[PDB]
Design an enzyme around this catalytic site. Sequence first.
Site, PDB file in Angstrom:
ATOM      1  N   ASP A 171       0.355  -1.285   0.298  1.00  0.00           N
ATOM      2  CA  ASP A 171       0.066   0.334   0.108  1.00  0.00           C
ATOM      3  C   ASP A 171       1.234   1.133  -0.127  1.00  0.00           C
ATOM      4  O   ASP A 171       0.167   2.238  -0.733  1.00  0.00           O
ATOM      5  CB  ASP A 171      -1.319   0.193   0.724  1.00  0.00           C
ATOM      6  CG  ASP A 171      -2.295  -0.703   0.612  1.00  0.00           C
ATOM      7  OD1 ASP A 171      -2.202  -1.478  -0.396  1.00  0.00           O
ATOM      8  OD2 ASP A 171      -3.306   0.002   1.467  1.00  0.00           O
ATOM      9  N   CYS A 206      -2.087   0.773 -13.365  1.00  0.00           N
ATOM     10  CA  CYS A 206      -1.905   0.424 -11.997  1.00  0.00           C
ATOM     11  C   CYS A 206      -3.112   1.428 -11.634  1.00  0.00           C
ATOM     12  O   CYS A 206      -5.087   1.114 -12.830  1.00  0.00           O
ATOM     13  CB  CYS A 206      -0.964   0.711 -11.846  1.00  0.00           C
ATOM     14  SG  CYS A 206       0.158   2.670 -12.225  1.00  0.00           S
ATOM     15  N   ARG A 266       3.920   2.211 -10.616  1.00  0.00           N
ATOM     16  CA  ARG A 266       4.147   0.411 -10.773  1.00  0.00           C
ATOM     17  C   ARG A 266       4.480   0.843 -12.515  1.00  0.00           C
ATOM     18  O   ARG A 266       5.220  -0.408 -13.209  1.00  0.00           O
ATOM     19  CB  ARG A 266       3.471  -0.218 -10.501  1.00  0.00           C
ATOM     20  CG  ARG A 266       3.093   0.323  -9.445  1.00  0.00           C
ATOM     21  CD  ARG A 266       1.958  -0.106  -8.312  1.00  0.00           C
ATOM     22  NE  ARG A 266       1.531   0.860  -7.306  1.00  0.00           N
ATOM     23  CZ  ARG A 266       0.645   0.011  -6.207  1.00  0.00           C
ATOM     24  NH1 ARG A 266      -0.183  -1.388  -6.455  1.00  0.00           N
ATOM     25  NH2 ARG A 266       0.194   0.955  -4.827  1.00  0.00           N
ATOM     26  N   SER A 267       3.058   0.992 -13.013  1.00  0.00           N
ATOM     27  CA  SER A 267       2.846   0.604 -14.301  1.00  0.00           C
ATOM     28  C   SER A 267       4.895   0.907 -15.407  1.00  0.00           C
ATOM     29  O   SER A 267       5.309   0.041 -16.693  1.00  0.00           O
ATOM     30  CB  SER A 267       2.178   1.767 -15.621  1.00  0.00           C
ATOM     31  OG  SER A 267       0.537   0.418 -14.859  1.00  0.00           O
ATOM     32  N   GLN A 324       6.456   8.011 -10.820  1.00  0.00           N
ATOM     33  CA  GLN A 324       6.087   8.712  -9.750  1.00  0.00           C
ATOM     34  C   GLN A 324       7.024   9.093  -8.332  1.00  0.00           C
ATOM     35  O   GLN A 324       6.819  10.768  -7.993  1.00  0.00           O
ATOM     36  CB  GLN A 324       4.919   8.847  -9.400  1.00  0.00           C
ATOM     37  CG  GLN A 324       3.846   9.035 -10.327  1.00  0.00           C
ATOM     38  CD  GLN A 324       2.741   7.908  -9.220  1.00  0.00           C
ATOM     39  OE1 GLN A 324       2.104   6.739  -9.152  1.00  0.00           O
ATOM     40  NE2 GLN A 324       1.619   8.800  -9.105  1.00  0.00           N
TER      41      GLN A 324
END
EC number: 3.1.3.48
Length: 284
Positions: free
Chosen positions: A181, A215, A221-222, A262
């Site tokens: 998370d 994602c 994450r992508s 990110q």
Amino acid sequence: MEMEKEFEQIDKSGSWAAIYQDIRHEASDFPSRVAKLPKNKNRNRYRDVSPFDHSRIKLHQEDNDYINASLIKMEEAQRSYILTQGPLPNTVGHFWEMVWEQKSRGVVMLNRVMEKGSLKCAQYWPQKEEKEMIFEDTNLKLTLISEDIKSYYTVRQLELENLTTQETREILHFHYTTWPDFGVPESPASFLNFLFKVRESGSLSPEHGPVVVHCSAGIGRSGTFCLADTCLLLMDKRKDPSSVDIKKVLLEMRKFRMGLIQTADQLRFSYLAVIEGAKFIMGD
Ligand SMILES: CSc1ncccc1C(N)=O
């Protein structure tokens, strides 16, 4: 500069935030005028994440061709990827239309439907064999064929039917279920295992349309997934493996979609994944 040494030099100097901001400053800025039209407000999950006009995927329909999705085309590596947001309640039909029209073999999902107690994407695939899904707006049917649940990921076989022509295709769903998370995984071992499973399926190969990767926003994450794959492929093609510059590959990919990677922690994790991944690539 051998990235393993660049790595230890940034860690010892604690400069990850500074390297990351330099990438943010040098990144391309292209127009996203179609994404911002008022008719498309309920097709975007996040106001600050849009596809560029030049690289956006177009839906094959005259009404409204818009989806929050980008074609990342890596010329030297000879790989293409579609990066997209997690589907919304009103774009699940658009999502499967895109998979059909682009001839994709695989979908890669890097998020859970619920994270941090909030919904990160729609439940867009069937959970039981005997309860199929029909998308009336795009005339598609989707059936769960089989499911293989492992400790770090699930692989599903899906059948997608174009109800207009009664043609069918097998789609493979690769679901990485253990990204935490908060932050990034401590070791890149299970993420690299997952990447190697997607590769072994044929989903990334030139006989198919591009893989669809998502994602929640389709940039963090992508971004890590496509950056690691492209860097490892380049290390296998080049005479000098040490010439691969991860920061230069990331800026090339940012010509096709904004915001890829990110956080400074995601940048460090991408370096870790490529450095560990090379050991197997170099037949070791
Ligand atoms: C150890 S070298 C190697 N091993 C496997 C695939 C490619 C290479 C290379 N020369 O880049």
